[PDB]
Amino acid sequence: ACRPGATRMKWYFQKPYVRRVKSDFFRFPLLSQVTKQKIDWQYHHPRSGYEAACIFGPNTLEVTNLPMGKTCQYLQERLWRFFGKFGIVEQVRVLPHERDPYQTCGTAYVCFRSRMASLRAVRLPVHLPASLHNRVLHLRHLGTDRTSDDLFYFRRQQAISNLVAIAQQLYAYLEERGPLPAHRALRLLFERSYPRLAWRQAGVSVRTCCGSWLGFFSRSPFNELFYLAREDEVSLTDREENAMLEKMVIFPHLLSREKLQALLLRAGRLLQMDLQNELSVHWRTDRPPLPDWTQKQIQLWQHQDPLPEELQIWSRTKDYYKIHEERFLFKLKLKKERAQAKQEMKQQRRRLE
Amino acid sequence: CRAAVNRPATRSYKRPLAHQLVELHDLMRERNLEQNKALEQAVLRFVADDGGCKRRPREVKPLLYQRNRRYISCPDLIPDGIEPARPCAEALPDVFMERQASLVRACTPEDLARQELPFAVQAETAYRRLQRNKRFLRFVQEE
């Protein structure tokens, strides 16, 4: 046992704060709306939430809801990488923990080189993998008081669902009434709100996901369910779209229950994939390449290289293992020789191409 | 049924049902088998614990008591005018010196047949005896 380093980190659960007595301000201090902490008038000063602006600048962000058990420096690099997409990041600052300098409190500041570049990062939130506790980041603009959309994902899900249901209803209607006009059939469709289920006219989910009625039909799974036909068979605003729709007839496709179900199911996976891809963009888009050295450097920030075997050899216990064994060395020599033969096969393809 | 009723009431355990027990009881009664030892023992055990629904911690009767234990006061419940029987006038004779002739008698084919009986009949006999030997004292007002 000895003094731990930065590798060792501990964190316990936090019990929610409940005021049992309202008239006892001594034993049950009132919470603060800014610092989210007990009001300490005796030793703490009142805050305003705009102190970082005078420090950094107007063109700044207030990121919150950070994970635990991660170094501030690692978080800074991660954040810089993330934020670099929009524009040139000036500086990233992280507030250490009160009781743990090697740990993050849960708040950070980001500075941009430009106003418009900063503005673009406020739109959507930040989603983290399982590695980071799946902690969703909350942003705020100090210059504009603009916040991010935290409910984007959950609202999209309901859209997906509504699409599914509208498809089903359309199919049913078609079945029950034969072919119907394009402009007339659509009126028999409804959707539901995300916050609380309430019947509403369809089209919000269509515009959200698909973006257009035409597109809805032109989709991959959707096209196998329905068929549009031009008036002779028997870059567009809302009015033009409507006018085009006014002279078309919808025809269903004869399908079985199992097939129908399968298709319906597939649609959802596709839609979900879409959503995921929207939130999982790369960090190296519209950027020049990087040297291998740089790549290595990047790698180092996450993962360490293996130890040389030369050194590792010494680790062998003399009790049960021979330090320097000729057969053991010969085996490693043969493995090293086989490595080049393996590499040549991969290298030959580039010359062939 | 007797073997299974004693098992726990967990997932990984086979246990019969109350209606199954009644159906089996009727089926056995029909064939003049209502007086079954195993059936009676299973029936008593089933209701001993509400068909396994009730559960209590493991309980072991005490076989010894500590010195200077607690004292509990209680009056006699036996009806008045009742006392234990007294022994014979002084003592019995010696076992080896006097009781040497009366302890031995000639054997008979009936004795041989009685000795050649199985264990199940003995066990049944015992059970029946204990069953039959269940009585209590009456009260003046009870009569």
Binding site: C2, P4, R8, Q42, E51, C54, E98, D100, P101 | -
Partner: protein, 132 residues
């Protein structure tokens, strides 16, 4: 050495030259610690200090004694100047403040008097003058 390191126990610090980490330190709350000497009492040091002396601006709120009569000319001049050049209450120190910055960062011309009004220092002023 007997046991090898791992992904969690490969970084260590010196016994004396180290960084306190109560959050990440072995402890036994359920055990008596004679090392801390729970019997021995300790004084109460001042929370705010200015030029090595108790902060005069924190007196009205936190209270405490003032060693005005022990000040020298050098100290007293600056002290006087401080109380004359538009003093601010946020200049005082804080005991375990929130991780976020303090209002002292800006120190701009405000439209109000934080904590106390300027009229609550004549008592101290008198003493200051006397000392002068």
């Amino acid at each position: 050495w007997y046991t090898p390191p791992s992904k969690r126990t490969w970084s260590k610090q010196h016994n004396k030259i180290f960084t306190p980490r109560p959050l990440s330190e072995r402890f036994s709350p359920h055990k008596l610690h004679p090392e801390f000497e729970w019997w021995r009492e300790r004084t109460v040091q001042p929370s705010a200090l200015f030029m090595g002396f108790p902060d005069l601006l924190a007196l009205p709120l936190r209270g405490g004694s003032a060693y005005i009569h022990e000040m020298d000319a050098a100290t007293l001049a600056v002290v006087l100047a401080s109380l004359a050049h538009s003093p601010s209450a946020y200049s005082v120190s804080e005991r375990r403040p929130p991780p976020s910055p303090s209002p002292a960062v800006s120190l701009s011309s405000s439209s109000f008097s934080p904590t106390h009004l300027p009229q609550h220092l004549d008592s101290l002023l008198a003493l200051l003058g006397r000392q002068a």
